[PDB]
């Protein structure tokens, strides 16, 4: 009969239940427990494992380069940013408010760290997330258009609830491809948030994309409903370098 | 806590477990046997329900017009066929032996009834089964060819473990399309069984397909490893008509 | 030290040597012959295993549906073909002589069986072989041409030393596509032998291709240097069927 | 039988084993040796030869102009650098720590020699290495991008475990292409070490690349995990010139 139980558990797609079937049976035998409570505990454990696996798969599908979280963020080293606003962002209210989040400032101040923290929080709460750099997004859209399948890649970049665009400005974009970025900003306008991190001021975006009018349209769509953070302070990388030296 | 159990059962894709959770819990409380045996009974009931649903889905996907069984076949009305051979067929040994089944004889003698019985038995033991008429098969193959997707339809007609070709001979096949049939008979040769029901003897197949050489090739391929039944006797439809009149 | 031996054997890409290292060492210790002879035996076994793996890979790339050999061929049941000629073919002299091999006769007389025997014999002696049906070859060439990459598939059909074309005559080839076959016959003309199995006489090939001039050109190119076999006798499939019944 | 052994050894891609086959056979015959130990010795010698050839091939693939090592470096002539730190670097702990190595100072003080020594040490221990000058790297990346194959060259520059950038500052980089260099620093950041030699201070990097912001970002990414050596003293080339004159 035990083998039949194992076979049924494996057939109903309950591997962890089969693995822990003996342990839970021993626990129920040693200590008197109602059947309802036993089943509730077993199903809750199975659901916990399923949710953990789902979160891991989501993190795999979001192409996050290095998992980070706000818990490791030292606001003492970055007094230029009000931690209250960051905590408000972590509420994920902007997702329902359809508001983008624009991080700005010098290199190595936590812009990418904060963006990845927000993306990780969104993933934890079940919000589909996708992380990518501006150069990579533009190149992928250009390649998809060259292959006559731009719509598929546009759906790929528009479906995620939270799209993170990292390092918008370090590498100048090819003007002929700049419009691709606009399309995303145009298709996620009042549909989904965009978490965009950059070191360039808005007025310089025309240089980045090589089209002043297109840059102005992109900025109008992106800044219509968004939260703009202008971070400042010394680079954290240099801080760690000095600490190691000292 | 019970609502949590219901939600978990719904999330685990076990609707019947959620539906019958209360009844089984009450039975276990009133009658205490064991936690292991209680879970065994629950999972066995769930497996039975899932198996029934899968069988129904297979029947729906097998394009069987009506559902028959060997139980309803009265061998007293058709003494010309030995029931022993039919029972041997019902063991589905021909599936492993790659043997084809051919039913021949006048109309209304149970050829299609036996073919559908064999198909239903094959579906019962989990073997994929498909049923189609020769005229419809040829027409669908021609239409797929005209639209440049003959390969997809050929895969559809070759995937099933047991393919039943019914009423091959009442309607003469289009000479420009009869070759399509051969292709199927060529692709399933020594790979999957074919259950073909017809009233025309083998020597007459040349008339049906409009090509003596193609007919001979088809017959040699189909009759290599095959069980040929030449049923006889008066039509059963007329027997029922006489019984109703009398 | 033995672990180092295992690691070195794995690094040199000799898995079988590492796996059988213990057995050969035990044999050498129990039975002493010579270091040179021990290494000779080890290397002979390794070469045999490598040759077997290479033959398996070639068969994977040779597209041989079922493996047959001349040993299982019963010339007593097929006296219409002189076994001496088949043995002469087994020498593979036609490969150097640039001579094709054409089999003709009624269905189910061993034509495909002999063609696959020749193909397997060629594969054994390191010759590249590729087996295909005429209809499938024509379909693949047409699809490649429609994709603008016909020459790639043409090379794929031309690269193998021995190309076997089966079922030429049972299905009429598309007149708009039969020329593709001609191209192969043109490209392998006195370049690499072709083993073609068919049931139609040469004069009828026009009906197969729908063009008398094209059929005549194909016949002239194929028969310029070839060995023609005209087999006769009852189909062996029907003989096996009668034996099973009797 | 000896010819068979030689043929098998050559087929199994063991040239040196066959070359020394007679010598090893004579050594085994003259002095009694267990077969296991004899095979261990033979495989060890083959592995040593393979390792030497692999190291030489890696040296050829990595464009090192002249081969040097630490043993040839005279710390007495360059007291400005502590030998202890160089020896610590030779342990290759930075590879596990993802720490870069920057050499700075006047020309001809051994920066290139030390970089080549570290690269050779990395190659010897089996770590993939690559050497190039900054101008050459920038030009190659620009040419690859102009051909629409920037990703392939980026992989080429990122795949090596230890990348050496020699003479970063002697030749000013084209402002339109400086970003290419950043890409490498952007992709090798926290992934693989970089050994960079320069005669320019960090504050002047903006002049080298012609973009203050890009230079600052490159420096922040490079110095996050790095070991910086400020070498001083007279030029070694001038020292040799004076010694030859005197
Ligand atoms: N306040 C901080 N607390 C903890 N880690 C930090 C902080 N600021 C930066 N870091 C770490 O420093 C490194 C660089 O910071 P980060 O990538 O977030 O900066 P950035 O603004 O995105 O930089 P860039 O412009 O170079 O892309 C990362 O490891 C990041 O985790
Ligand atoms: N011996 C029998 N017992 C029970 N039902 C029978 C029997 N013979 C025939 N029938 C029923 O009579 C009807 C006609 O029989 P069936 O369709 O199997 O005959 P057939 O020879 O395949 O017909 P056709 O040539 O018209 O396709 C069906 O309902 C079949 O179930
Ligand atoms: N002489 C024989 N000895 C053994 N088996 C045979 C012999 N002749 C035919 N067979 C078997 O009969 C079956 C059909 O024969 P084969 O595969 O050679 O096809 P074929 O006659 O070339 O077919 P077609 O004319 O349709 O192309 C195969 O199982 C083959 O092994
Ligand atoms: N301490 C030393 N011991 C041995 N050889 C040395 C030493 N210093 C320099 N050399 C040799 O002097 C020549 C030039 O030195 P090297 O290229 O290493 O210096 P550098 O500072 O990188 O030069 P530059 O900036 O002019 O290109 C090379 O042959 C190097 O091997
Ligand atoms: Mg960043
Ligand atoms: Mg019927
Ligand atoms: Mg054949
Ligand atoms: Mg130098």
Author numbering:
A (entry chain C), B (entry chain D), C (entry chain B), D (entry chain A): 1 to 246
Task: Give the authors' words.
IstB, similar to the MuB and TnsC helper proteins, is a member of the AAA+ family and a close paralogue of the DnaC/I helicase loader. However, this tetramer state is inactive and requires the regulatory IstB factor to perform transposition.
A 3.2 Å resolution structure of IstB bound to target DNA reveals how specific elements of the N-terminal dimerization and AAA+ ATPase domains facilitate protein oligomerization to engage and bend a 60 bp duplex while maintaining an ATPase-repressed state. In accord with previous low-resolution studies, the cryo-EM structure showed that IstB utilizes its N-terminal domains to form dimers that oligomerize into a clamshell-shaped, two-fold symmetric decamer through ATP-dependent AAA+ domain interactions. That is, the inverted arrangement of two AAA+ domain pentamers, the DNA-binding surfaces of which face one another owing to the molecular two-fold axes of their associated N-terminal domains, sterically prevents the binding of a sixth ATPase subunit to the complex in this configuration. In the IstB decamer, eight out of the ten nucleotide-binding sites adopt a canonical AAA+ ATPase configuration. The first 65 residues of IstB are composed of 3 small α-helices, which form the dimerization interface of the protein and connect through an elongated helical extension to the AAA+ domain. Close inspection of the complex revealed the presence of numerous positively charged residues that interact with the target DNA, which partially explained the 30-fold increase in duplex affinity observed for the full-length protein compared with the isolated ATPase module (Kd,app of 40 nM versus 1.5 µM, respectively). These amino acids, together with a conserved region of the AAA+ domains known as the initiator-specific motif, form an internal cavity within each IstB dimer that engages DNA primarily through nonspecific contacts to the phosphodiester backbone. The subsequent assembly of IstB dimers into the final decameric state in turn generates a continuous, U-shaped channel that tracks the periodicity of the duplex DNA (about 10.5 bp) and introduces an approximate 180° curve into the target molecule.
